[PDB]
Amino acid sequence: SQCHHMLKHLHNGARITVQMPPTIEGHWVSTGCEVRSGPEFMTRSYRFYNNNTFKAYQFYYGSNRCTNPTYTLIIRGKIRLRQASWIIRGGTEADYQLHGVQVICHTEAVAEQLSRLVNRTCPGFLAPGGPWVQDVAYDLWQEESNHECTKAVNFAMHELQLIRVEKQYPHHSLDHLVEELFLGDIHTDATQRVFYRPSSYQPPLQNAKNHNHACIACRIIFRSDEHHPPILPPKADLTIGLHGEWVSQRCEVRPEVLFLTRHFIFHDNNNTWEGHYYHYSDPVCKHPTFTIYARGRYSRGVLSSKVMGGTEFVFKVNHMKVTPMDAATASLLNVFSGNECGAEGSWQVGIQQDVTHTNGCVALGIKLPHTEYEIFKMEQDTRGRYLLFNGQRPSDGSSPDRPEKRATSYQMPLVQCA
Ligand SMILES: *[C@@H]1O[C@H](CO)[C@@H](O)[C@H](O)[C@H]1NC(C)=O
Ligand SMILES: *[C@@H]1O[C@H](CO)[C@@H](O)[C@H](O)[C@H]1NC(C)=O
Ligand SMILES: *[C@@H]1O[C@H](CO)[C@@H](O)[C@H](O)[C@H]1NC(C)=O
Ligand SMILES: [Cl-]
């Protein structure tokens, strides 16, 4: 349970086998109320058939608890697995074709808002005297009319272009197999979604044959359909008391910067925080590259009016240290810290060093102090362990350096370790 042990044995010490190319045939379902940027509160129910065809449900909701369905998208098409990604090691690229996008509204208020918005976005879509009514499926992608209005909901299915299936087993055994389908991540800027080729992953979907059995959401979503959306349990929101230590549960993938694990320490006495960011080149986080240590201060919590269930925080980084973890990294840091700004840093593999030099010249152009506007939430897993979520990093590689760039979605959770 110690933070170091949990960072050495990610995901409860489970062993993963990745079959490349993956087998995606089956019914894949969400494990909870997912948050896409927006915010968009949703769950997924994806069927991939042996005919390389697909039926995907996207159930949307009005709240972070996924208890009041608003509208549901039924997406049909075909998928074609291509070659293994060279951008994201462990991922397989795929190509897809959409063949239909249907929408069903679940309340009369949503039926009215959506029909009006689609008509505003695509002036001719709707006939003169016929507003949408609830519980009726409506074609948003009318194919053979060459007229579509997926732009009204800023819809894109590019998540299907990056695919990874992990077979997870607790202990070195072939028992209690959980199959997880990772699909491409969703851009944090909804306008850029139709242009975004995924470079990381959404939260994993679980297989209907090989799912965690304590996952109540999984069963609710398995048995759902477009007319009976999954009603998730009305769990109460927990109050964020940023305290203790937290570590990554998985080897996380971030766009362009490769793979990583995190260790956070919060000091509720003086509202100070520390973070370790262990960077790796491999999708199993066994081949390290460099490590970053950050320390600073954080503000008090304010409940968000933009993301239900979120608590807004302001974080300030005052001090930062870097540890090279391979010869290439130490060499690069030595070449730049010396041949340009500064004189000597003697970067060494495994040796931590501050990036603010005594003369105040920071290496690689880092700007300290740095302020980030964060969003946090705390949940519990099926074993009751607390989980800490912070804001999804902006997809372009930018930092949430202004309040208007604060995330409306979250990263993969950290789990409490002390
Ligand atoms: C593919 O065959 C499956 C049965 O394996 C069927 O359910 C599905 O309708 C077919 N393709 C389409 C249109 O999704
Ligand atoms: C919009 O919808 C109304 C009501 O359904 C309909 O009368 C009208 O023709 C539509 N057209 C435009 C341009 O919005
Ligand atoms: C805050 O308190 C912690 C002890 O919990 C201590 O390690 C740290 O140095 C303190 N920071 C400041 C700025 O006082
Ligand atoms: Cl972070």
The pick from 119, 122, 125, 132 for probing ligand 2's pocket by mutation, whose C-beta has the most ligand atoms within 8 angstroms, reads 119
The pick from 245, 266, 269, 272 for probing ligand 3's pocket by mutation, whose C-beta has the most ligand atoms within 8 angstroms, reads 272
The pick from 27, 51, 57, 96 for probing ligand 1's pocket by mutation, whose C-beta has the most ligand atoms within 8 angstroms, reads 51
Domain count, the chain: 2
How many residues appear in the chain? 418
Task: Find the ligand nearest to 55 CA.
Answer: 1
Q: Is residue 230 part of a domain?
A: no
205/256 same-domain check: no
CA dist 122 → 116, 149, 150, 153, 182 (Å): 10, 6, 10, 12, 33
31/123 same-domain check: yes
| Domain of 273, in residue numbers | 244-416
Indicate which technique resolved this structure: X-ray
CA of 242 to the centre of ligand 3 (A): 15
Q: Is residue 7 part of a domain?
A: no
Q: Is residue 90 part of a domain?
A: yes
Give nearest CA residue, ligand 2 atom 3: 128
Q: Is residue 233 part of a domain?
A: no
91/177 same-domain check: yes
313/347 same-domain check: yes
Is residue 360 in contact with ligand 2, taking CB distance under 6 Å? no
180/31 same-domain check: yes
Burial of residue 387 (CB within 10 Å: 0-12, 13-18, 19+) is middle
Beta bridge partners of 183: 163
Beta bridge partners of 297: 272, 316
170/249 same-domain check: no
Angle, CA of 389, 392 and 396, to the nearest 5°:
165
172/51 same-domain check: yes
Which is it for strands 311-324 and 288-298: parallel, antiparallel or unpaired? antiparallel
Is residue 119 in contact with ligand 2, taking CB distance under 6 Å? yes
Q: Report how far residue 197's alpha carbon sits from residue 239's, in angstroms, rounded to the nearest whole number.
A: 36
Asked if residue 76 lies in contact with residue 140, where contact means CB atoms within 8 angstroms, the answer is no
174/315 same-domain check: no
Q: What is the resolution of this structure in A?
A: 2.2
Q: List all residues whose CB is within 6 A of at least one atom of ligand 1.
A: 49-51, 53, 55
* 331: Cα within 13 Å, side-chain hemisphere: 3
Q: Where among 222, 253, 272 does a domain terminate?
A: 222
Closest-CA residue to 47 (of 80, 95, 79, 81): 79
The pick from 49, 74, 75 for probing ligand 1's pocket by mutation, whose C-beta has the most ligand atoms within 8 angstroms, reads 49
58/168 same-domain check: yes
Q: Is residue 4 part of a domain?
A: no
Q: Is residue 239 part of a domain?
A: no
Asked if residue 167 lies in contact with residue 177, where contact means CB atoms within 8 angstroms, the answer is yes
Q: Report how far residue 117's alpha carbon sits from residue 150's, in angstroms, rounded to the nearest whole number.
A: 11
Give nearest CA residue, ligand 1 atom 14: 53
270/185 same-domain check: no
Is residue 267 in contact with ligand 3, taking CB distance under 6 Å? yes
Q: Is residue 232 part of a domain?
A: no
Give nearest CA residue, ligand 3 atom 2: 270
Q: Report how far residue 292's alpha carbon sits from residue 290's, in angstroms, rounded to the nearest whole number.
A: 7
Is residue 295 in contact with ligand 3, taking CB distance under 6 Å? no
270/407 same-domain check: yes
255/360 same-domain check: yes
Terminal-residue alpha carbon distance, the chain: 8
Q: Is residue 131 part of a domain?
A: yes
